[PDB]
Amino acid sequence: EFDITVVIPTFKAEKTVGQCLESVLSQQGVSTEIIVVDGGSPDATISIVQSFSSTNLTIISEPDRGIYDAINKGVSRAQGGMIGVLGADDVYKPNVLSVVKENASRGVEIVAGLTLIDGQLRADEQYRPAALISGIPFGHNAMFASQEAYRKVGLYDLAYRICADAEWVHRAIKSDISCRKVEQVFVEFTNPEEIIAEACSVIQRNFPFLLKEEAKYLLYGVRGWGETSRIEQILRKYGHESVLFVTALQEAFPAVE
Numbered sequence: 001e002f003d004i005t006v007v008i009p010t011f012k013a014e015k016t017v018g019q020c021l022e023s024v025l026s027q028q029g030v031s032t033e034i035i036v037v038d039g040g041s042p043d044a045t046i047s048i049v050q051s052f053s054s055t056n057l058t059i060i061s062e063p064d065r066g067i068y069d070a071i072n073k074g075v076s077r078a079q080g081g082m083i084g085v086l087g088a089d090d091v092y093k094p095n096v097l098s099v100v101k102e103n104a105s106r107g108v109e110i111v112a113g114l115t116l117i118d119g120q121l122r123a124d125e126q127y128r129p130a131a132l133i134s135g136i137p138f139g140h141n142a143m144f145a146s147q148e149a150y151r152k153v154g155l156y157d158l159a160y161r162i163c164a165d166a167e168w169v170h171r172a173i174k175s176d177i178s179c180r181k182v183e184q185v186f187v188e189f190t191n192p193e194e195i196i197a198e199a200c201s202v203i204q205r206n207f208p209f210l211l212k213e214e215a216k217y218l219l220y221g222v223r224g225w226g227e228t229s230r231i232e233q234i235l236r237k238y239g240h241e242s243v244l245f246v247t248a249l250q251e252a253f254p255a256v257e
């Protein structure tokens with residue numbers, strides 16, 4: 001089979017899809033499959049992709065219901081041991097795929113790296129229960145997940161048009177999926193009210209006893225956006241509900257007990 005499958009959802013990505021594909025095809029030391037899931041682009045996207053005429057490239061081009069619908073189609077079609085998702089405006093750095101393969105050959109089901117955004121490292125968090133009161137702990141495009149991880153966790157939830165990837169990683173955490181974080185840049189490259197609303201909803205899916213405002217308080221508090229003096233009240237209010245919730249808060253807020 002293939003060591004790696006890269007799923008690349010595209011729509012009107014003619015400006016950058018070529019650089020994206022070049023960053024994948026240059027990866028040495030792995031057998032790689034590429035699945036481009038195009039949403040019906042009217043521009044030169046499909047032409048550019050097909051200029052990469054190869055058998056390890058599959059092109060799907062049909063209307064879909066958004067980015068995560070396309071991602072789900074690509075993940076379902078992947079035949080690589082480890083599956084990555086790369087956007088058409090993103091690029092993998094040199095040697096990332098061999099690093100992924102190296103770390104996966106030891107049994108780990110998820111390998112994630114760092115993300116460079118506008119010349120800055122994404123402010124990642126640990127893959128652990130504390131992530132469940134926050135967003136996605138690493139950049140989604142820096143994440144590689146095995147076939148077994150996807151089989152166990154499932155596909156992305158189309159109800160979350162923005163933060164389905166966070167919701168997926170939280171399900172991974174709750175399913176005890178093993179993760180290895182690599183301290184190397186793997187990848188370089190919407191209303192804010194909407195992003196926050198989805199992020200709070202995802203957290204409520206972990207802890208459904210939470211009111212929306214309590215999920216927002218925890219998210220802002222872990223992210224360093226808001227105060228944390230109420231954390232002990234939330235813990236006393238809900239600590240009886242779930243040890244996983246207690247673990248998340250005491251990992252995220254070590255000063256509290």
Ligand SMILES: CCCCCCCCO[C@@H]1O[C@@H](C)[C@@H](O)[C@@H](O[C@H]2O[C@H](C)[C@H](O)[C@H](O[C@@H]3O[C@H](CO)[C@@H](O)[C@H](O)[C@H]3O)[C@@H]2OC(C)=O)[C@@H]1O
Nearest residue numbers: 122123124135136139140141162163165166192195199225
């Ligand atoms: C109301 C005042 C409190 C402070 C507000 C936030 C400060 C500025 O933050 C920026 O705007 C908000 C809306 C977010 O867009 C921030 O992005 C981070 O927080 C998000 C919740 C999200 O976790 C995001 O990571 C990306 O998430 C998407 C969807 O899950 C994912 O596809 C990408 O791969 C992730 O990079 C950001 O998280 C971090 C640690 O950067 C934004 O910074």
Ligand SMILES: Nc1nc2c(ncn2[C@@H]2O[C@H](COP(=O)(O)O)[C@@H](O)[C@H]2O)c(=O)[nH]1
Nearest residue numbers: 009010011013037038039066067070087088
């Ligand atoms: N297949 C598909 N891809 C999309 C859709 N919307 C955005 N994309 C692609 O998903 C990635 C995210 O880019 P964004 O538009 O979120 O900045 C890019 O590769 C973009 O071309 C869509 O509706 N369908």
